[PDB]
């Protein structure tokens, strides 16, 4: 009810003591949680979404709770607290939580060492949902140390952590991209080359997008060289996704940069690769159009 | 005791590609040692 | 007693530069990719400043 | 402690040789009879600071003649690198029990000389000087770090603990 | 404790160093002590830890805990927070200006000499005592005056052989103030020692009006709140791979007992029921009453120790009015107590029910003037200790005023904390306070539950102990609702906690 109510109406008239007992019953509900439900999550998200700026004085309380939960023994509650962070992430800042949003930044940089995929994925989600509000160049762990830490995670062979990791690296390569070195981007290219075999298609589309972003940050030529050598692989669904990626690189950085190399590669006498070239031109003419 | 300065271990896809290539050289060797004029490798491999 | 500065931290340099140590769990050094000013870099730069 | 000092005494008595042989070099006369050596009478503390300065210079000349610019030996005789050293320097700059045993013996004498310098500069005391000297000699183990280069030192170190206990 | 891909040779063999690394981090104040045989001392790189050897496993753990200049960042946050406290309370303390010395970027981890942290500028003049410990009360702000104060923060990392931080703070103060290298821009200040390995704190220095309670509170809040410290504690937990099991962060709120169960003593005194009269009527219609014996209650809950100083009505003869002269007795009695105490049970802060009785014992306790005395903002049901069968009849039929000692923690200190035994106790005491009858039936549920004759409470198991915790607390809530017209499902977690615990 309360969630439906304040979500439709707004929280203008909710006075002091009322809002207090509300925030507190909220904390209780969320700890007391004993089911895997978005019920209490969405309740929390909405309630602080409407408290807007009313929530300043309880951020020690709210976080301290969430952090003690983040310390727990059983995975489930840990994961829950990571979720709840990913909800309230925006208001965490918007109340100017220097100590506190700084907290969540560095402390999650700590938990990046987990080995329960179910918690590691949620941690990556919460870090992404912090970086969305606070941009790159005032992140509490500078992405100059974040992304180097992230690259050895791309090898985690699990759908949820892989989804969220490639999401975070795609954000960074899109916008950050210059607090990192060319060599870092090259290693990360070589790791992306084998996300193209995940069993989930969201991962593979995210991978192709980030190949695009890396072609924008670094020049196209080295990434294109690393894509042709992948075309030489067999098994079709990672050949086809590298051929999408070639199309994407060519679309962003103009097609004259890549067309000669594609055409020239049409001469290596192998089948899978001549067909890779032809399929890539297919996608390319679709993407560029007029 | 391993050594420092090394990459990883080749992944099954690369191991497969090079198993293939080695097999092909095995074939070229045998058709060499058996001197076949009835052979071709076509422009598609 | 007579104190020193314990000078070289133990930073598996294969890991730190290339994110990958061939030894894995047994690398007797510290898996760490953190660039950060050292125990003498700062001293020297400040005093030269 | 009593018993282990007894043991040392007995062994010394048991293993005693007559001096068995003689040839009779005199190092310092052979030195003085040469045209490069002069002589004097000086103050102890003065020759002490002298000896320490000379040792420091010798060892630094050794390093810098070996062209090891990235290492520097400071004044309490600790050796400290001023860079991060690559492999080739990590290796070229290794030293052995000779170099390090001198280093640490010089460090012992420098600590002694400098307690005496504190006293004669006037900061401390006769009683504070005597107690400090007693310290230095009992706790050579944790001031210098010579045992790591001649681990047969722990003969001595156990002897000085046993004395300390008795006294 | 902490309930494919293809690997190269040296991955498929060679040990795993991580469990060795965490065994060493856990056992580390022993593996790294200071009283050693031969071993040459050395400072860890960017910090103030000493090693007396070369134990690479331990050095790696410790280094990776203190990465990114965490040691100095801790020093800088602690100094900022102290500043801010002074920023605020300038007014009451007469502080005209507050001076934070622009920092030498190496003051935190140079250990034999010190700049200073906070320069305090009065408005007019402070008259200042001699130095004592931050846990000692009687302070004579008379000796000197000044407008210049310095404040020092020194961080250590103690170990098993040496982690007393009172004597650390004393020695560092005496030395660093009578040395010839530390540049103190005043002849007066204070030194505040933090022990990061044991999360301890204290201070020694020259004080002035307000400083003792001001610092005491600011320190106890920093040690709990600061964000640097939090990152420290959190790298430590994760390098150990330790997890908690309790949800809700048991009852550690900035309330006193997270300060109180500490290895430093704190006593709890009840003198509300030392005077009691028992009433029965005459054949005359007048209900005449006879005075009966009483008892001062002294408690150490980090021990489960009661001194029961039973008062006799031998003193009801010719003392004019009961209450204030009773204040006077309690005063001189606790004074004699400290006199007769040996040097490892000497009390450090003593909190009484009677905030009105602090003054007489305040004055009387100057033969032992180290005593932080207070009145407790959380009254604990030692008045419900009149209810039990052993203690009561003891007092009632005693003839000579006397001392007794009980260990209310019957066998508990084997398989619970002083924390948990104190909490459970509070449950039991308040249960006698509120009902005594549902109390009997809850704490002796089984027909043949027994007590060993040296027990205050029966011999249970953990199962029924957790069950009866919930039961007694159910009772406390039920009875609050019954005597205040309330829904007990209505209360919030804070409300139920604080009604269970004390006042609000
Ligand atoms: O390890 P060490 O260099 O010898 O010195 C210490 C210390 O010496 P200092 O007083 O010289 O600082 C005490 O020795 P005493 O003064 O008591 O003789 C001490 O003795 P306690 O701790 O027992 O008081 C202790 O002994 P141990 O390490 O066996 O506990 C030990 O002296 P020793 O190492 O010579 O024993
Ligand atoms: Mg080898
Ligand atoms: Zn390594």
Curated annotation (Swiss-Prot), chain A:
<feature type="repeat" description="HEAT 8">
    <location>
        <begin position="140"/>
        <end position="178"/>
    </location>
</feature>
<feature type="repeat" description="HEAT 10">
    <location>
        <begin position="252"/>
        <end position="290"/>
    </location>
</feature>
<comment type="similarity">
    <text>Belongs to the SF3B1 family.</text>
</comment>
<feature type="site" description="Interaction with RNA">
    <location>
        <position position="179"/>
    </location>
</feature>
<comment type="subunit">
    <text>Component of the 17S U2 SnRNP complex, a ribonucleoprotein complex that contains small nuclear RNA (snRNA) U2 and a number of specific proteins. Part of the SF3B subcomplex of the 17S U2 SnRNP complex. SF3B associates with the splicing subcomplex SF3A and a 12S RNA unit to form the U2 small nuclear ribonucleoproteins complex (U2 snRNP). Within the SF3B complex, interacts directly (via HEAT domain) with SF3B3, SF3B5, SF3B6 and (via HEAT domain) with PHF5A. The SF3B subcomplex interacts with U2AF2. Identified in the spliceosome C complex.</text>
</comment>
<protein>
    <recommendedName>
        <fullName>Splicing factor 3B subunit 1</fullName>
    </recommendedName>
</protein>
<feature type="site" description="Interaction with RNA">
    <location>
        <position position="271"/>
    </location>
</feature>
<feature type="site" description="Interaction with RNA">
    <location>
        <position position="165"/>
    </location>
</feature>
<feature type="region of interest" description="Interaction with PHF5A">
    <location>
        <begin position="286"/>
        <end position="287"/>
    </location>
</feature>
<comment type="function">
    <text>Component of the 17S U2 SnRNP complex of the spliceosome, a large ribonucleoprotein complex that removes introns from transcribed pre-mRNAs. The 17S U2 SnRNP complex (1) directly participates in early spliceosome assembly and (2) mediates recognition of the intron branch site during pre-mRNA splicing by promoting the selection of the pre-mRNA branch-site adenosine, the nucleophile for the first step of splicing.</text>
</comment>
<feature type="repeat" description="HEAT 9">
    <location>
        <begin position="182"/>
        <end position="220"/>
    </location>
</feature>
UniProtKB/Swiss-Prot annotation, chain B:
<comment type="function">
    <text>Component of the 17S U2 SnRNP complex of the spliceosome, a large ribonucleoprotein complex that removes introns from transcribed pre-mRNAs. The 17S U2 SnRNP complex (1) directly participates in early spliceosome assembly and (2) mediates recognition of the intron branch site during pre-mRNA splicing by promoting the selection of the pre-mRNA branch-site adenosine, the nucleophile for the first step of splicing.</text>
</comment>
<comment type="subunit">
    <text>Component of the 17S U2 SnRNP complex, a ribonucleoprotein complex that contains small nuclear RNA (snRNA) U2 and a number of specific proteins. Part of the SF3A subcomplex of the 17S U2 SnRNP complex which is composed of three subunits; SF3A3/SAP61, SF3A2/SAP62 and SF3A1/SAP114. SF3A associates with the splicing factor SF3B and a 12S RNA unit to form the mature 17S U2 small nuclear ribonucleoprotein complex (17S U2 snRNP). Identified in the spliceosome 'E' complex, a precursor of the spliceosome 'A' complex. Identified in the spliceosome 'A' and 'B' complexes.</text>
</comment>
<feature type="region of interest" description="Disordered">
    <location>
        <begin position="1"/>
        <end position="20"/>
    </location>
</feature>
<comment type="similarity">
    <text>Belongs to the SF3A2 family.</text>
</comment>
<feature type="modified residue" description="N6-acetyllysine">
    <location>
        <position position="3"/>
    </location>
</feature>
<protein>
    <recommendedName>
        <fullName>Splicing factor 3A subunit 2</fullName>
    </recommendedName>
</protein>
Curated annotation (Swiss-Prot), chain C:
<comment type="function">
    <text>Required for pre-mRNA splicing as component of the spliceosome. As a component of the minor spliceosome, involved in the splicing of U12-type introns in pre-mRNAs. E3 ubiquitin-protein ligase that catalyzes the transfer of ubiquitin onto target proteins. Catalyzes polyubiquitination of SNRNP200/BRR2 with non-canonical 'Lys-63'-linked polyubiquitin chains. Plays a role in DNA repair via its role in the synthesis of 'Lys-63'-linked polyubiquitin chains that recruit ALKBH3 and the ASCC complex to sites of DNA damage by alkylating agents.</text>
</comment>
<comment type="subunit">
    <text>Component of pre-catalytic and catalytic spliceosome complexes. Interacts (via N-terminus) with the spliceosome subunit SNRNP200/BRR2. Component of the minor spliceosome, which splices U12-type introns. Within this complex, interacts with SCNM1 and CRIPT.</text>
</comment>
<feature type="zinc finger region" description="C3H1-type">
    <location>
        <begin position="6"/>
        <end position="34"/>
    </location>
</feature>
<protein>
    <recommendedName>
        <fullName>E3 ubiquitin-protein ligase RNF113A</fullName>
    </recommendedName>
</protein>
Swiss-Prot record, chain D:
<comment type="function">
    <text>Plays a role in pre-mRNA splicing as core component of precatalytic, catalytic and postcatalytic spliceosomal complexes, both of the predominant U2-type spliceosome and the minor U12-type spliceosome. Functions as a scaffold that mediates the ordered assembly of spliceosomal proteins and snRNAs. Required for the assembly of the U4/U6-U5 tri-snRNP complex, a building block of the spliceosome. Functions as a scaffold that positions spliceosomal U2, U5 and U6 snRNAs at splice sites on pre-mRNA substrates, so that splicing can occur. Interacts with both the 5' and the 3' splice site.</text>
</comment>
<comment type="subunit">
    <text>Part of the U5 snRNP complex. Component of the U4/U6-U5 tri-snRNP complex composed of the U4, U6 and U5 snRNAs and at least PRPF3, PRPF4, PRPF6, PRPF8, PRPF31, SNRNP200, TXNL4A, SNRNP40, DDX23, CD2BP2, PPIH, SNU13, EFTUD2, SART1 and USP39. Component of the U5.U4atac/U6atac snRNP complexes in U12-dependent spliceosomes. Within the minor spliceosome, which acts on U12-type introns, interacts with PPIL2 and RBM48. Core component of U2-type precatalytic, catalytic and postcatalytic spliceosomal complexes. Found in a mRNA splicing-dependent exon junction complex (EJC) with SRRM1.</text>
</comment>
<protein>
    <recommendedName>
        <fullName>Pre-mRNA-processing-splicing factor 8</fullName>
    </recommendedName>
</protein>
């Amino acid at each position: 009810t309360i969630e439906k109510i304040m979500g439709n109406l707004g929280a203008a008239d909710i006075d002091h003591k009322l809002e207090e007992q509300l925030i507190d019953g909220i904390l209780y509900a969320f700890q007391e949680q004993t089911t895997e439900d978005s019920v209490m999550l969405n309740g929390f998200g909405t309630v602080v979404n409407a408290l807007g700026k009313r929530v300043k004085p309880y951020l020690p309380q709210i976080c301290g709770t969430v952090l003690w939960r983040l310390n727990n023994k059983s995975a489930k509650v840990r994961q829950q607290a990571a979720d709840l962070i990913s909800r309230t992430a925006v208001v965490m800042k918007t109340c100017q939580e220097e100590k506190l949003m700084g907290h969540l930044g560095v402390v999650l940089y700590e938990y990046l060492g987990e080995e329960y995929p179910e918690v590691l994925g949620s941690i990556l989600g919460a870090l992404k949902a912090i970086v969305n509000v606070i941009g790159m160049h005032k992140m509490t762990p500078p992405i100059k140390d974040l992304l180097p830490r992230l690259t050895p995670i791309l090898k985690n062979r699990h759908e949820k952590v892989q989804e969220n990791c490639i999401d975070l690296v795609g954000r960074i390569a899109d916008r950050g991209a210059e607090y990192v070195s060319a060599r870092e981007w090259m290693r990360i290219c070589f790791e992306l080359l084998e996300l193209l075999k995940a069993h989930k298609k969201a991962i593979r589309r995210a991978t192709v997008n980030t190949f695009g972003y890396i072609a924008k940050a670094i020049g196209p030529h080295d990434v294109l060289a690393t894509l042709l050598n992948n075309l030489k692989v067999q098994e079709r669904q990672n050949r086809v996704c590298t051929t999408v990626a070639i199309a994407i690189v060519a679309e962003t950085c103009s097609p004259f940069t890549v067309l000669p190399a594609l055409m020239n590669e049409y001469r290596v006498p192998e089948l899978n690769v001549q067909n890779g070239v032809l399929k890539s031109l297919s996608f390319l003419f679709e993407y560029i159009g007029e | 005791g391993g050594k420092t300065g090394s990459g990883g271990v080749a992944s099954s896809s690369e191991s497969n590609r090079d198993r293939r290539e080695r097999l092909r050289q095995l074939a070229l060797e045998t058709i060499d040692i058996n001197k076949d004029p009835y052979f071709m490798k076509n422009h598609l491999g | 007693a007579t104190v020193r500065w314990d000078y070289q931290p133990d930073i598996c340099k294969d890991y730190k530069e290339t994110g990958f140590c061939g030894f894995g769990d047994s690398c007797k050094f510290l898996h760490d990719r953190s660039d950060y000013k050292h125990g003498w870099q700062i001293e020297r730069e400040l005093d030269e400043g | 402690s009593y018993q282990k000092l007894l043991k040392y005494y007995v062994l010394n008595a048991l293993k005693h040789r007559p001096p068995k042989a003689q040839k009779k070099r005199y190092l310092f006369r052979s030195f003085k009879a040469t045209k490069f050596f002069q002589s004097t009478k000086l103050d102890w503390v003065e020759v002490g600071l002298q000896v320490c300065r000379q040792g420091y210079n010798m060892l630094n000349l050794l390093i810098h003649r070996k062209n090891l610019n990235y290492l520097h030996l400071d004044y309490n005789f600790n050796l400290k690198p001023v860079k991060t050293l690559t492999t080739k320097e990590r290796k070229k700059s290794r030293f052995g029990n000779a170099f390090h045993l001198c280093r640490e013996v010089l460090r012992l004498t420098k600590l002694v000389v400098d307690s005496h310098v504190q006293y004669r500069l006037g900061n401390v005391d006769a009683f504070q000087l005597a107690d400090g000297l007693q310290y230095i000699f009992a706790h050579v183990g944790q001031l210098t770090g010579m045992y790591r280069y001649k681990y047969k030192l722990m003969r001595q170190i156990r002897m000085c603990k046993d004395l300390k206990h008795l006294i | 404790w902490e309930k494919w891909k293809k690997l190269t040779n040296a991955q498929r063999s060679g040990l795993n160093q991580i469990p060795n690394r965490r065994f060493t981090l856990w056992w580390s104040p022993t593996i790294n002590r200071a009283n050693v045989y031969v071993g040459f001392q050395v400072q860890l790189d960017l910090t103030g830890i000493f090693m007396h050897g070369k134990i690479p496993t331990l050095k790696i753990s410790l280094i990776q805990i203190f990465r990114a200049h965490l040691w100095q960042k801790i020093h800088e946050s602690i100094v900022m927070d102290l500043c801010q406290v002074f920023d605020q309370e300038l007014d009451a303390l007469e502080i005209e200006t507050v001076q934070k010395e622009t920092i030498h970027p190496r003051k935190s981890y140079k250990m034999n000499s010190s700049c200073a942290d906070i320069l305090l500028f009065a408005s007019y003049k402070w008259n200042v005592s001699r130095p004592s410990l931050l846990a000692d009360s009687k302070d004579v702000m008379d000796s000197t005056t000044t407008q210049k104060y310095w404040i020092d923060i020194q961080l250590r990392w103690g170990d098993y052989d040496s982690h007393d931080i009172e004597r650390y703070a004393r020695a560092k103060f005496l030395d660093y103030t009578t040395d010839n290298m530390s540049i103190y821009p005043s002849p007066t200040g204070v030194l505040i020692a933090i022990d990061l390995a044991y999360n301890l704190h204290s201070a020694y220095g020259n004080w002035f009006p307000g400083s003792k309670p001001l610092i005491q509170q600011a320190m106890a809040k920093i040690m709990k709140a600061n964000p640097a410290l939090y990152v420290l504690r959190e790298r430590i937990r994760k390098g150990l791979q330790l997890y908690s099991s309790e949800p809700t962060e048991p009852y550690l709120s900035s309330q006193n007992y997270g300060e109180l169960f500490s290895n430093q003593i704190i006593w709890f005194v009840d003198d509300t029921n030392v005077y009691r009269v028992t009433i029965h009527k005459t054949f005359e219609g007048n209900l005449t009453t006879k005075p009966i014996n009483g008892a001062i209650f002294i408690f150490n809950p980090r021990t489960g120790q009661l001194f029961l100083k039973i008062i006799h009505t031998s003193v009801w003869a010719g003392q004019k009015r009961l209450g204030q002269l009773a204040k006077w007795k309690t005063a001189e009695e606790v004074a004699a107590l400290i006199r007769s105490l040996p040097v490892e049970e000497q009390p450090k802060q003593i909190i009484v029910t009677r905030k009105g009785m602090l003054d007489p014992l305040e004055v009387h306790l100057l033969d032992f003037p180290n005593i932080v005395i207070k009145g407790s903002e959380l009254q604990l049901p030692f008045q419900a200790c009149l209810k039990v069968e052993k203690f009561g009849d003891l007092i009632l039929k005693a003839t000579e005023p006397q001392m007794v000692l009980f260990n209310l923690y019957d066998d508990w200190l084997k398989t619970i904390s002083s924390y948990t035994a104190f909490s459970r106790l509070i449950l039991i005491l308040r249960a006698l306070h509120v009902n005594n009858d549902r109390a009997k039936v809850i704490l002796k549920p089984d027909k043949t539950t027994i007590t060993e004759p040296h027990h205050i409470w029966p011999t249970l198991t953990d199962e029924e102990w957790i069950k009866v915790e919930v039961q007694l607390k159910d009772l406390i809530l039920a009875d609050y609702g019954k005597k205040n017209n309330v829904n007990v499902a209505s209360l919030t977690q804070s409300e139920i906690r604080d009604i269970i615990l004390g006042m609000e």
